[PDB]
């Protein structure tokens, strides 16, 4: 009789099924349909295990764990019938069960995660990962540490480790293009010390070298030669 409005995996996440369960248990305890408080407890602990191992259950549970029920004379909230620790375990299970009850969700999320760790730009993997963390909050609405929230953590702390290498490969690319500008600057300084009346050679094999420039090739003068003429033409 509970599988009438607590099985359709779209009828759980509705916000009335919580009220339906509260009214079921209450009117069963009052109107004799549920006689014994040692039996309403079994109905609770079996309906919660039906609704936890089923897609759509985490939010039904998080909604019902705030409704009031009166058992054994003492009135309480369903998060407190079951202990705090046991409710934590329950919500963890209710969130992570919809990822091993259907393998389509597991496939889909794992492939988006992995195709998000393989984007070339590490900064454009992070918005993909916030996308994944945004489509996890639609299936797991409680803050426990489900194993999928471990996929996302390893993905983020893997993209950081990827950026530690991508930045090293960008600094090695601004090292070989600041050398090739240092060389043109020193060649210009040599030409200018030779023009203004000072006796220093201007062959490319006689420039100074200081580990910001490296050894001078011939093509680092051709480049300079076509670039003074280009600049003098533009004046």
């Amino acid at each position: 009789e509970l599988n009438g409005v607590l099985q359709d995996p779209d009828m759980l996440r509705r916000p009335d099924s919580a009220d339906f369960f509260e009214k079921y248990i209450d009117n069963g305890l009052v109107t004799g349909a549920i006689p014994s408080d040692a039996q309403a407890t079994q109905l609770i602990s079996q309906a919660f295990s039906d609704a936890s191992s089923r897609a759509g259950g985490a939010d039904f549970l998080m909604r019902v764990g705030d409704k009031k029920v009166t058992l054994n004379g003492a009135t309480t909230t369903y998060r407190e019938l079951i202990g705090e620790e046991q409710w934590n375990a329950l919500m963890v299970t209710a969130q992570r069960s919809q990822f091993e009850t259907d393998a389509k969700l597991n496939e889909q999320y794992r492939l988006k995660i992995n195709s998000a760790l393989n984007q070339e730009d590490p900064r454009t993997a992070w918005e993909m990962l916030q996308g994944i963390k945004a489509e996890l909050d639609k299936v797991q609405p409680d803050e426990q540490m489900t194993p999928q929230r471990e996929w996302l953590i390893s993905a983020q702390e893997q993209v950081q480790n990827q950026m530690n290498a991508w930045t090293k490969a960008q600094a090695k690319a601004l090292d070989d293009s600041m050398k090739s500008m240092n060389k043109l600057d020193v060649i210009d300084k040599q030409f200018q010390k030779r023009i203004n009346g000072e006796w220093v050679s201007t062959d490319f094999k006689d420039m100074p070298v200081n580990e910001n420039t490296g050894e001078f090739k011939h093509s680092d003068m051709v480049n300079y030669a076509n670039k003074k003429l280009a600049e003098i033409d533009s004046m």
């Binding site: 590490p122 900064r123 992070w126 916030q130 963390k133 945004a134 609405p141 983020q156 530690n164 930045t167």
Partner: protein, 151 residues
């Protein structure tokens, strides 16, 4: 990675450019693209009408004026329309931004908004600032505050 304390020619110019939007935003929109307006697209220079701070900041101030004026209360929508134009690519996003469907805007518009909402003011600010937290009560970390010291 950025602050409002160090002042240079940028803060010297946007004091009047904002008078001809917001000085805090216009100082920030330029910083993210050209560290201290970087209209890199050739069509953006032919449409916006170069490398001169007398008109570059004046070009951004004019666009960001209309972009922050096309709704008058959505400054994050303005920053989004800036680097994502309203032709054939931004239209599917801008209609998906107001409905709160940030999972379907872009991989670049979100990263852009998430870097500038700390100085910008929108009604959807606190709704994107928590768009992708690890738990629905959490806050999703933008690209350059989780990748802070890595360099």
């Amino acid at each position: 990675y950025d602050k409002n304390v160090p002042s240079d020619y940028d803060g010297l110019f946007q004091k009047a450019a904002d008078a001809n939007v917001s000085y805090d935003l216009l100082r920030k929109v330029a910083w993210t693209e050209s560290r201290f307006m970087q209209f890199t697209k050739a069509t953006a220079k032919a449409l916006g009408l170069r490398l001169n701070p007398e008109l570059a900041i004046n070009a951004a101030a004019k666009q960001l004026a209309g972009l922050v004026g096309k709704f008058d209360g959505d400054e994050l929508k303005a920053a989004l329309a800036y680097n994502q134009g309203e032709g054939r690519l931004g239209n599917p996003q801008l209609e998906a931004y107001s409905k709160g469907d940030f999972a379907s805007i872009s991989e670049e518009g979100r990263n852009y908004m998430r870097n500038l909402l700390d100085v910008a003011k929108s009604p959807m600010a606190g709704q994107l600032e928590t768009f992708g937290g690890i738990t629905p009560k959490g806050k999703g970390i933008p690209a350059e505050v989780g990748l802070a010291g890595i360099g």
